[PDB]
Design a protein around this ligand. Structure first.
Ligand SMILES: Nc1nc2c(ncn2[C@@H]2O[C@H](COP(=O)(O)OP(=O)(O)NP(=O)(O)O)[C@@H](O)[C@H]2O)c(=O)[nH]1
Ligand SMILES: [Mg+2]
Length: 170
């Protein structure tokens, strides 16, 4: 089928760069203008392994330990991107909770899940090691990748990987 449509949800704690990472991929630039997000949606077109896709990305509002996991992000979502900031132990802690809830909500369905450690560029502020987040991604039997919302190639690698990870379960 010349084109396929997939809906991806980008979840995580606030300020980690869910939007930055999303816009970088979608528009190609890096915005510094920190705007708390309500919910944005961009429809990006990208091809993976010859197959072109129609990606409907849902850049969600940041949540935390005690926040209801939106039931709509529980249905009709083909892939999930759970991003944390390697410069924040709190984001790391929180993503484990969001992941927990997410799994409960969705019940038992083979939905691709990948873990992203954002802000690899800010070397002087990293507190989470690569090997650590990596280990988490393995415990979830999920994909892992680190990234910078200022390093397009890596942002693109993120959205490519999830689809790779998805067409694998289908
Ligand atoms: N140096 C650097 N800064 C980054 C990176 N990703 C995001 N940031 C910065 O971190 C801040 C928050 O990013 P943003 O995308 O708004 O985070 P968010 O998770 O979408 N926040 P919210 O949940 O409130 O909607 C911005 O000022 C942004 O420029 C990165 O890879 N490197
Ligand atoms: Mg946002």
């Amino acid at each position: 089928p010349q084109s396929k449509s997939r809906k991806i949800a980008i979840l995580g704690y606030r300020s980690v760069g869910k939007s930055s990472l999303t816009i970088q991929f979608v528009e190609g630039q890096f915005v510094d203008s920190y705007d708390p997000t309500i919910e944005n949606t961009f429809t990006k077109l990208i091809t993976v392994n010859g197959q072109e896709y129609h990606l409907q990305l849902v850049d969600t509002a940041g949540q935390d330990e005690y926040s209801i996991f939106p039931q709509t992000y529980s249905i009709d979502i083909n892939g999930y991107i759970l991003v944390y900031s390697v410069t924040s132990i709190k984001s790391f802690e929180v993503i484990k909770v969001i992941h927990g809830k997410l799994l409960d909500m969705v019940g038992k369905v083979q939905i691709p899940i990948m873990l992203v450690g954002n802000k690899k560029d800010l070397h002087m502020e990293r507190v989470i090691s690569y090997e650590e987040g990596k280990a988490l991604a393995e415990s979830w039997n999920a994909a892992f990748l680190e990234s910078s919302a200022k390093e397009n190639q890596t942002a693109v690698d993120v959205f490519r990987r999830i689809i790779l990870e998805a067409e694998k379960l289908e």
